[PDB]
Write a protein that binds this DNA or RNA. Structure first.
Ligand SMILES: [Zn+2]
Ligand SMILES: [Zn+2]
Ligand SMILES: [Zn+2]
Lengths: 196, 194, 195
DNA sequence: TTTCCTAGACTTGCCCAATTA
DNA sequence: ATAATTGGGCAAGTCTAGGAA
């Protein structure tokens, strides 16, 4: 079938695991993750921290890349991108390309790719060790379009694929989580878990 | 211009074969002998077998192209719907406007005829391997038949054309195709139909 | 011309017109009524016309189409698109915006405008029927609804299809009525019923 | 001559639930 | 448990006949 980006979990030689903040579902939450759903709920354009767990430190030049792909097989060949309303928004942080759904916050070494071959979008940052006195590395992502954006994701489930790659682009590890960009993360999360 | 869906089992005796898929609900690809219709899912493998009576010369290429089955619509270049085209992906070769792609063939070529604009994918004709009887080409349909803005629910014909390095028609065949979710349930049904 | 003749003349080549076969469905964009010898269709769509012949007209031959009002009282007036429709429909670099009738799918179209009669025509080159075919098909588009106030204004038109030579001398001639509308099928179904 | 409707019955993707191995 | 595959069914969306202003 038409090839699509790989999404299988691979801890790699460095024991790469992804972590998240345990925010709860109170009405004030801006980003909340559901361990039972392996799903992150976040608000549009707000901080979403993502934790990198490693058992041994990766080599130097190590990069961390994120990519969104549709969860369903029937839509996997579709490149996740912002709806037209959104790409057209003046919401540029000056670094990200207007069509990318995923941005990286507060990292001037942030890099964006428009795959020449697959048309696929992604954001990379250099991998940093955990801030001394720290257990893991944190990355602040932002999702720039809502799940409900007709014309975009349109209510379809998206996965965020986090890849650990050497300076040459080789795969060192991969992990993933589902994401839902919506107005009320606490409410939505509670509910979807309410279903189980 | 415009292209024919006229069989030309030619001087080589060109014929197409299809696998025996089964009718589960949602089978990936399935062909209906009675209907002469392929029923497949978007982006899934659509195997099409090439059978000749005699090996064609070298330079021979295989071409696929779609057309609307219906009279009026035959003039409308068949292509991907706006949405899918906009959010298209690719494999390093396939252009975003093409509906039909060829899977696993680093030698594939994609054409958008400058004088018809008509789109097509052509691969070299490879004689079957020693001990084989036919040669398979795997195709993928990038939009469902019901893609509003595209297929808009209208029937298409896939026309395979054997041709020489020159571009001369050496052979011709066709099949209709229905890209849908659930090719299984839909073939039964359209059979129940008779 | 001031009002070209619309008389049928198969002439030396056994020139005939053919038409597709669809019923009165709403989903039927274009439809020909043999009884009414009228063709209904809807704005901007495909109108397939079958060019039958008994004798193969020589290379260079041409097929010109022209619309004329049907009523005598309207005959001398040129059929043109309304001013509205005229300020947009110009897609397909060959078709001038005023022309009501266009042909699609032919690199060689040639638009006319009698400089002395102002009548608009779409010319094409005669072409033999497809290898295993018994007729050549032309794809016609009718650029305005017969409704266009300021355009056809509910007035019936006739399309005269002529076979001519490189010089433009007439060879054969047919014609038929066209009703550009809203979901054509019914109109025929009905047009055929008062009958 | 268009424009509304009123539904009903399909068309058709995709949910969910059972079920395989 | 655990993922993949499947079949039941559904409901958003389509076009219908059809009468009406
Ligand atoms: Zn959006
Ligand atoms: Zn599509
Ligand atoms: Zn008009």
């Amino acid at each position: 079938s038409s090839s699509v980006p790989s999404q299988k979990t691979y801890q790699g030689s460095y024991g790469f695991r992804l972590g998240f903040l345990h925010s709860g579902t109170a009405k004030s939450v801006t980003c909340t993750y559901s361990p039972a759903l392996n799903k992150m709920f976040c608000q549009l354009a707000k901080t979403c921290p993502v934790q990198l767990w490693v058992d041994s430190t990766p080599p130097p030049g190590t990069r961390v890349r994120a990519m969104a792909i549709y969860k369903q097989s029937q839509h996997m060949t579709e490149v996740v991108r912002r709806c037209p309303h959104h790409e057209r928004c003046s919401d540029s942080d000056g670094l990200a390309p207007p069509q990318h759904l995923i941005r990286v916050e507060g990292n001037l070494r942030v890099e964006y790719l428009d795959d020449r071959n697959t048309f696929r979008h992604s954001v990379v940052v250099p991998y940093e060790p955990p801030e001394v006195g720290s257990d893991c590395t944190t990355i602040h992502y932002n999702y720039m379009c809502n799940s409900s954006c007709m014309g975009g994701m349109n209510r379809r489930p998206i996965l965020t694929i986090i890849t650990l790659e050497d300076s040459s682009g080789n795969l060192l590890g991969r992990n993933s989580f589902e994401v839902r960009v919506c107005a009320c993360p606490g409410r939505d999360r509670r509910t979807e878990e309410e279903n189980l």
